[PDB]
């Protein structure tokens, strides 16, 4: 199967920098939809980052454009979502998605902005 | 020394002929409207999976949690999240632009996406059948009984398709509608040609073209007036009921009566026509003895080699022309501009294109005009299909240029095929060319079915077919010298020259 173990969570000061990784196996990272979703505590699913195969297209959301960027690594078969200019409302759990039609919702990483 | 002498003797410019030819061609507006109606009656509005009622939207705070988004910024059109699972609680549509269509009533969407095109292909199968068999049935029965039957059948089928319990009823009634509509389209023109004298031949054809274009206008007018599909189909099909009601007032063509072996009916019809035309005195001299003394095949098509090649090339020409024309006409949901405006613009460009090709063929030639119409149409369709969806006004201008080119190619191919075949088999050639065009309209929706493999591939095929048709159209020679070939041997002798 396809495993999307993800790590990078922790305690980071507001406005800090973090590079969380979503390790992949069993398929190249340039073939399917490496999407991203997050659950703020008490909030519903939200769309933040998304890429398509071969990396010629990439789209963001209203609260994501111009502030966060998504990267890929074909050699490591990993997709990276760096985090800069955090706000107190950004605390969430980021979900890694294999495909738009993938039942493999990731286990998620807890990101805290603190003060 | 023929029926034509009696026709001038009876009339030719009288009130009866003009009133009958403006009264039998009026339903061609709805003929064109019914042919194209799938644009407005089966438009696809934006849609997405409906979240199950188990989840509460009050605590969700939005519908993004239960709907994946595509690259365009809209919710997914076939899929739903699990907290992924396919649409199993149906779909949700909007009513901002299209209040209702067939793809809204019977959710003809992903995993049923092909069924609307299948219904269209079944309607065109009905067209082909109701031409092929009803031509023989009209030759064996008449040209007025067949016309009234066509009016009744098209009206009944239109209403019954407007009220369809499910999709299968819709497809079957569309097949019957195609039957009747092809029969009326191919019978009204021949009845008008038979009744009217030689002077207004192809003048009736110009009138038919004008009526078709006016019907293209009228379709957009009704669509703007009535957007609901169950009401749009009813409004477009109701006047066919009054058409069947008042079409008992037609008068059978005297040529068919004479060809049936009886001249008493021909004499009665001619005296009636003289009576309504007001010149009873001149028609009084008519009698049975006067009529008698004055009124005096695919096998060989597929046997003769030169005839085989001529038929094959003309068949490909009709195939490509109808194929591309219908593929372009019945695909205007994704052209940016509103449906009604682009429809009336297509109807508008219909006329100047026909004027231009007529001027060119009467000045330059027929084969070059057909070539420059078909190749330009194919190029326009290709460059329309390769341009990204973001552009709207340039795409619409390209589409209207393409339709102008298709109409010019239609006129050119009809004229050339009329003045190309030998008089022995010319009528059979024209009929088989029309059959080829009808099966082309059959196959065009089947090609458009394959949008699932690639969204723009139907346009690619619709534009690639005419290009290869024009490329392989090589044996057909120019006919500007007006030789009017009579027999196969004369065709061979003039072929070398």
UniProtKB/Swiss-Prot annotation, chain B:
* Example GO BP: monoatomic anion transport
Q: What does this protein do?
A: Secondary active transporter that functions as a Na(+)-independent organic anion (OA)/dicarboxylate antiporter where the uptake of one molecule of OA into the cell is coupled with an efflux of one molecule of intracellular dicarboxylate such as alpha-ketoglutarate or glutarate. Mediates the uptake of OA across the basolateral side of proximal tubule epithelial cells, thereby contributing to the renal elimination of endogenous OA from the systemic circulation into the urine.
The UniProt similarity line reads:
Belongs to the major facilitator (TC 2.A.1) superfamily. Organic cation transporter (TC 2.A.1.19) family.
Q: Where in the cell is it found?
A: Cell membrane; Basolateral cell membrane; Basal cell membrane
The chain's Cytoplasmic topological domains, given as residue ranges, are: 1-9, 139-146, 199-206, 252-309, 362-367, 419-456
Answer yes or no on keyword Cell inner membrane.
no
One Pfam family hit: Sugar_tr
Q: What Gene Ontology molecular function terms does this protein carry? A: alpha-ketoglutarate transmembrane transporter activity; antiporter activity; chloride ion binding; identical protein binding; organic anion transmembrane transporter activity; prostaglandin transmembrane transporter activity; sodium-independent organic anion transmembrane transporter activity; solute:inorganic anion antiporter activity
- Kindly give any further remark recorded in the entry: Involved in the renal transport of a variety of drugs with well-known nephrotoxic potential, therefore may play a role in the etiology of the drug-associated nephrotoxicity. Uptakes the diagnostic agent PAH/para-aminohippurate and clinically used drugs. Mediates the bidirectional transport of PAH/para-aminohippurate.
Extracellular-side stretches of the chain, per the record, are 31-117, 170-177, 228-230, 331-340, 389-397
**What is the protein name stated in its UniProt record?**
Solute carrier family 22 member 6
Q: Which UniProt keywords apply?
A: Cell membrane, Glycoprotein, Membrane, Transmembrane, Transmembrane helix
Q: Which organism is it from?
A: Rattus norvegicus
Superkingdom of origin organism: Eukaryota
What's the PTM story here? Glycosylated. Glycosylation is necessary for proper targeting of the transporter to the plasma membrane.
Found, by tissue, as follows: Highly expressed in kidney; in the particular segment of the proximal tubule. In kidney, found preferentially in the cortex and outer medulla and weakly in the inner medulla. Expressed to a lower extent in brain.
